[PDB]
Structures are given as structure tokens and as C-alpha cells.
Amino acid sequence: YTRVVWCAVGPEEQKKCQQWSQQSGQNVTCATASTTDDCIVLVLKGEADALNLDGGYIYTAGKCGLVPVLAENRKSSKHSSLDCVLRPTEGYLAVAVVKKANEGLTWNSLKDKKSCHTAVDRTAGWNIPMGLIVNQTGSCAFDEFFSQSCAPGADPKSRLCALCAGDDQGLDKCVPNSKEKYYGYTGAFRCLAEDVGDVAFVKNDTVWENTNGESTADWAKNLKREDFRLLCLDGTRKPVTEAQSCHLAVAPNHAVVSRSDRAAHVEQVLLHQQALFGKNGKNCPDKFCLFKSETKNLLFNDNTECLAKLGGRPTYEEYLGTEYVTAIANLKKCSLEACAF
């Protein structure tokens, strides 16, 4: 009864959740799903209590009645005096990244190039870029803009999946979990880094966390920030240090969602779990760090300082903000009220 059930997406997050469970003395327990969507369903059904979601997915969840509870918060210079849990959430930047070596490639020369997406329905990896591409294009046939792509979640036999690779064996191609080589913020960036795609739609933080020896993963080891560039909307290319004047949009933080009739009990049990396994907990270094998964963003983004109270009891539209909610609406008519389930 004072026990939360977490939904994990893919085998790798189940292994992280079970590990969390053991350390929690069953205060927390796990359910597994092959995708975020089924995870949401499990939550509607009541078979699981919560998960942490990217904005794009929250939108979905919110039509189905789920509610944002706590948000991911990361480090900052502004607001310093404030404790992380109470500090407001700053947001994150969706940027388009390309190889410097790849000269002359601008936002305007994107037609027919190869693209790398975090996964379909996500904010930075999908909703923003295609939103804009649709708008500028007048067409809804965004499935034809890029000659080939890796957009996890799309029809595997489509070209949107042409660039995805599956796991060790090439099984599970294009599934939207971390089983797919190019899935998620990291996969997407790995996709470009290895020159599979010409372009990767990921957040700003991702370029910085995988270059200049920040990641140590064999494909990330030798990567150098200066070999990358950002695509601006004025069709101009800037270094990755100019994110603030060359981004596609600022996204709302990933956050934990739950059923409204459970939000209270999830919030409660969670803040206490963060006291223990969070950035500065009784047991982080030593036994288990909720926000570490080694460059993999499992359960939570790896750069999370803490999970923050929301303050102002946000309904999801409010949490996502009117700007973003519209950009999502206009995109969805291509392919306005429901529970997609």
C-alpha cells in the first residue's frame, strides 16, 4: 500500500529497476513493457503506477488521464539559492547536429539527406523537427522528406527504419526501447557520429555528454566537439557552444507521470527514494544511484540532479505549455482529443 510499481521499457531498464527494487526492500517494484506505449497502458489498467516520460509521450498520457507528478531537474547557474527539489525546471534545447567535415549542409539542404531520430513521438527527436519540416513543407508526407532514416517506432519495413540496426544480432530492428543501437538521445547521436545519418535530432546536452572524453564508450571515446556543428533556423552553422542562439525549440523536462488517483502516493514514496539513491543520498556512491546507468539514460536521464516538485499543480497542458501543445496538434492531424488507446 505504501508500495509503488514502476514500469520499465525494455530488458535493460528492467535490469536497472529490479536492482532498484532489491535495494528498496520492495518499497518499489517493477513491470516490464516492450514500449513506452504499453507502459502507459499498464498504468491506465492499474497494473503499474508510474514512469518517467519525455514530453511527447506525456502528451499522449495526458489525453488518457495521467498526471505529471515530479520533474527531472539538472544543474544551473541561475536560481542557485534554491534547493533542487523546489527549484523551477529550466527546460532543455532541441538542436540539430551535423558533422563539421560535412560542409555546406544546412537546414535548407535537408531534403533527401539521412536522418537520426531519438524515436517517433518524442520532443527533440521527432515532434519539433518534423513539426517544422511539415509546416515549412506544406506537405504531411514527412515520411518522404528524408531519403532514409532511423526513427524508432516507425514501420520497420519503411525507410524511416532503413537506418536502424537492432541489437547484437540485428534482432528487434527499429523498436523504440534501448535495445536498438540508434534509439534514444544516445543512439541517435551514435547514429550520426558513426556517419550512418547525415543529421541527428537530439538535445544540446547530448552533444556535450558524448564528446571530449565525457562518455568513454568505444564509439564516443575519440569524439571531439569541434567536429560537430548545429543547424540553425536562419540556415547557418554554429559551433556547439552557441546552443542558445542556434536551437530548434526549448523542451519541457522529462517527468514522472501517474494516474491522478495515485499521484499523491507516488510523489511521496519517490522523494523518499531520492533521499536515498539520488545525487546526494545516504546510499548513492556506495550502494545504488538512481540517476546513474552509465551513459544510457535508463529510467531517468543520466544528467538529472534531482526530481523536482512542480508547484502550481500542473495539468499536462499547463506542464507542456501552450506553445508545445499546439505544435503537437498541428502535427497529429497529418497522421485533436482522444486516449490513443
Ligand SMILES: *[C@@H]1O[C@H](CO)[C@@H](O[C@@H]2O[C@H](CO)[C@@H](O[C@@H]3O[C@H](CO)[C@@H](O[C@H]4O[C@H](CO)[C@@H](O[C@H]5O[C@H](CO)[C@@H](O[C@H]6O[C@H](CO)[C@@H](O)[C@H](O)[C@@H]6O)[C@H](O)[C@@H]5O)[C@H](O)[C@@H]4O)[C@H](O)[C@@H]3O)[C@H](O)[C@H]2NC(C)=O)[C@H](O)[C@H]1NC(C)=O
Ligand atoms: C548545453 O548542455 C550542456 C550539457 O549539460 C551544458 O554544459 C554543462 O553545463 C553546466 C552548467 O552550465 C556546466 O557547469 C559545471 O557543472 C559541472 C558538472 O557537470 C561542474 O564542472 C565540473 O565537473 C564537470 C564534469 O562533471 C567538468 O565539466 C567540464 O570540464 C571537463 C573538461 O573541461 C570535463 O569533465 C571532466 O570531469 C569529469 C568529473 O566528473 C570527469 O568524469 C571527466 O572525465 C572529465 O575529465 C567536461 O568536458 C566538461 O567540459 C569539470 O571538470 C568541472 O570540474 C561545475 O560545477 C560547473 O558548474 C557543466 O560543466 C556542463 N557540462 C559539461 C559536460 O561540460 C550547457 O550548459 C548547455 N549550454 C547551453 C547553451 O544550454
Ligand SMILES: *[C@@H]1O[C@H](CO)[C@@H](O[C@@H]2O[C@H](CO)[C@@H](O[C@@H]3O[C@H](CO)[C@@H](O)[C@H](O)[C@@H]3O)[C@H](O)[C@H]2NC(C)=O)[C@H](O)[C@H]1NC(C)=O
Ligand atoms: C505549425 O503551423 C501552425 C499553424 O500556424 C503553428 O501554429 C501557431 O502557433 C502560434 C504559437 O504557438 C499560435 O499563436 C498563439 O496564439 C494565441 C492566441 O490564439 C496568442 O495569444 C499566443 O500568444 C500565441 O501567439 C498560433 O495561434 C498557432 N496557430 C494554430 C493553428 O495553432 C504551429 O506552431 C507550427 N508548428 C511548429 C512546430 O512550429
Ligand SMILES: *[C@@H]1O[C@H](CO)[C@@H](O)[C@H](O)[C@H]1NC(C)=O
Ligand atoms: C520502505 O518504506 C518505509 C516507509 O518510509 C521506510 O521505513 C523504509 O526505509 C523503506 N525502505 C527503504 C530501504 O527505503
Ligand SMILES: OC[C@H]1O[C@@H](O)[C@@H](O)[C@@H](O)[C@@H]1O
Ligand atoms: O513544463 C514547464 C514549462 O516548460 C516551459 O518550457 C514552457 O513550456 C512552459 O509553458 C511550461 O509550463
Ligand SMILES: [Fe+3]
Ligand atoms: Fe526528450
Ligand SMILES: [Zn+2]
Ligand atoms: Zn529559443
Ligand SMILES: [Zn+2]
Ligand atoms: Zn492551473
